[PDB]
Amino acid sequence: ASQVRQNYHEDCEASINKQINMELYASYVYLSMAYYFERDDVALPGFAKFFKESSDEEREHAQTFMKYQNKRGGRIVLQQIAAPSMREWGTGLEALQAALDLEKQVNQSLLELHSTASGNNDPHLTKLLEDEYLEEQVDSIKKIGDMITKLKRAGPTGLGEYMFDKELN
Amino acid sequence: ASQVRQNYHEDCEASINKQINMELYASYVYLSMAYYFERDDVALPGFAKFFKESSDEEREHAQTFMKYQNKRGGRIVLQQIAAPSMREWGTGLEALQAALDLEKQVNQSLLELHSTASGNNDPHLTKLLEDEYLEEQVDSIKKIGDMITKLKRAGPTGLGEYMFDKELN
Amino acid sequence: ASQVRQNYHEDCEASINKQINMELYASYVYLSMAYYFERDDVALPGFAKFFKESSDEEREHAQTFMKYQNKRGGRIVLQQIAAPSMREWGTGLEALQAALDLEKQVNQSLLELHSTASGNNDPHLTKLLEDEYLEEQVDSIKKIGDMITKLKRAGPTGLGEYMFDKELN
Amino acid sequence: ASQVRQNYHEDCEASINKQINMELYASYVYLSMAYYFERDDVALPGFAKFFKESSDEEREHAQTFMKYQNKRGGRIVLQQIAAPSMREWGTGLEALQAALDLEKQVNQSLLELHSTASGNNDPHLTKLLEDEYLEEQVDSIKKIGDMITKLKRAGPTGLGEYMFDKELN
Ligand SMILES: [Fe+3]
Ligand SMILES: [Fe+3]
Ligand SMILES: [Fe+3]
Ligand SMILES: [Fe+3]
């Protein structure tokens, strides 16, 4: 064990590692989405910049978990990162319904982790998750939900999608 | 009691108290509409900003009458504020016609209050109403009218509404 | 309907709607007190400014819950806002003890709402309540307490109240 | 008659002259009050500055009436100015109850004049009075009423009056 380790149970150390992987996976789906919308036969630069910033952001989240793992005395164990579930991501609206569901799975994974931290009476870890991750996921979800409604209104394809893309840039 | 009351009749004092309630109700209707247009399944932020400013400006008008009541010597009587007729305000065009409707009611009330003021030979109260309320009300009716015409032209729903929303923002 | 709702239970949604009403009522009580202390026969402008800011900060809290309801997926239900228990709030000290009383009621409500949030394992709702409401409420109770003690020392009426008013300004 | 005179009835010309005198008289009472409070055995510099500014202000009002008399084609007829009703003005509170009543008489005289202007269908003159004089008198009255209440609270004499005077400076 570690010299700084205090009130840090093996269960929570294990879930932070699985969470790290999950965040890297989401970062990777989003990176895949960013350059999909930069294809000449797609050409949605607003959508691309948006999923690029999302990929950055998820990768940021993984690093903060890694830093926390070290801060409490746990040990970072890095696993394989899966291929993006798709190689081609469809229409703008389809890519957004995808990210909505993906941020929801992550939200679900984070809430299960907060439950683990309560159960093990780790107030430091519950505060971490309530302040850096659960706040972030709920805002992210609401933002994409707004976007899905806005994009459906403009017409999810054709001229409306062209205009919506501009406003996302 | 009061030491400033001069040429201030009781049915004008009563009218002002009843007007303060009407203004607070309208403030709460526009507040209601404000947040309706933030629901993730409505997502019309321009409509939301326009109605939040409207809630503000109506609450201001109520405050201004409260200040007036005291300036003249009358006594403020605040009644309960009715719940808005709706929880869901429908489409952007339906909410605009609701506001147009509502502004005209407030205008009619204000014009009755102006009449009562003349009837009792209160030139101060008429001046207050003419400079502070009837001027603003007729302006605000003309604007919501312009808005309704523009929105019907842009196509009341669809891409047009998405575009008309962005100008309101 | 909503596309963002995740881990958002109905009795928390209901509590938030009932809390929004409570906040709007308190906003209207402080509004009432605000203008009471402007009557030409009361003329306590420091007390008036303190209660007008209080009306503002309570209306803000209601708005913040409204924003939260939408962020989580719940649906805002606005009820009628009761008329304040009084039209004349008595002396400066009597109005302060009224506010102290009222703030504690809101605090008790908020603490019940926090309890309901834990009961349903909503760590987001507890975090919202802890950072946004319980923190501000306990601060505001401590301030009105300090105020009440100072005003009783300065002599609750008389010259002391005239002087204590000027500090509040 | 005059080359610019249009829709200006002899009645309204006559009342503007009596009003001019009245304003000069009030200016003169206030000048008398200003230097009363500068006596070594009184020494209330706040009260003095306040009635000095009032004397200025009333004298200003008389001039604006004179200018209006010329603007419409009437002719300024200047009468004797009475001695101030008192040579010694008593306590601070007594001087303020005096000015309150004096501004009320003037308000009464102005309202009678507005009535004359309505009766003669002179919209220019009713607008003049509603915008430069009735607005001014109601504010003045409310201000002095506030002051009478504030001063009674501080204790209308002794230490409280000393402190109130400072705040008026
Ligand atoms: Fe993440
Ligand atoms: Fe209004
Ligand atoms: Fe509150
Ligand atoms: Fe005057």
Author numbering:
A (entry chain B), B (entry chain D), C (entry chain D), D (entry chain B): 2 to 56, 58 to 99, 101 to 172
What do the study's own words say?
Ferritin represents a class of natural protein nanocages, which is an iron storage protein that widely exists in nature. Ferritin consists of 24 subunits that self-assemble into a 432-point symmetrical cage-like structure with 12 of the two-fold, 8 of the 3-fold, and 6 of the 4-fold channels. The ferritin nanocage structure endows it with unique functions: the primary function of ferritin is to store iron while playing an important role in detoxification of iron and oxygen-related radical products in vivo. In this study, for the first time, we demonstrated that the ferritin from kuruma prawns (Marsupenaeus japonicus), named MjF, has a pronouncedly larger ability to resist denaturation induced by Cd2+ and Hg2+ as compared to its analogue, human H-chain ferritin (HuHF), despite the fact that these two proteins share a high similarity in protein structure.
To obtain direct evidence for the binding of Hg2+ and Cd2+ to MjF, we tried to crystallize MjF upon mixing with heavy metal ions (Hg2+ and Cd2+, respectively) by screening a wide range of solution conditions at 20 °C. Eventually, we were able to crystallize both complexes of MjF plus Hg2+ and MjF plus Cd2+ with good diffraction and solved their structure at a resolution of 2.3 Å (I4 space group) and 3.0 Å (P6322 space group), respectively. Thus, it seems that these two heavy metal ions exhibit higher selectivity for Cys residues in protein. In contrast, each MjF subunit only contains one Cys residue at position 13, which is located within the 3-fold channel. Consequently, it is hard for Hg2+ or Cd2+ to cross-link MjF molecules through its coordination with Cys13 residues due to seriously steric hindrance. Since there are 24 subunits per ferritin molecule, these findings suggest that each subunit may capture three Cd2+ in solution.
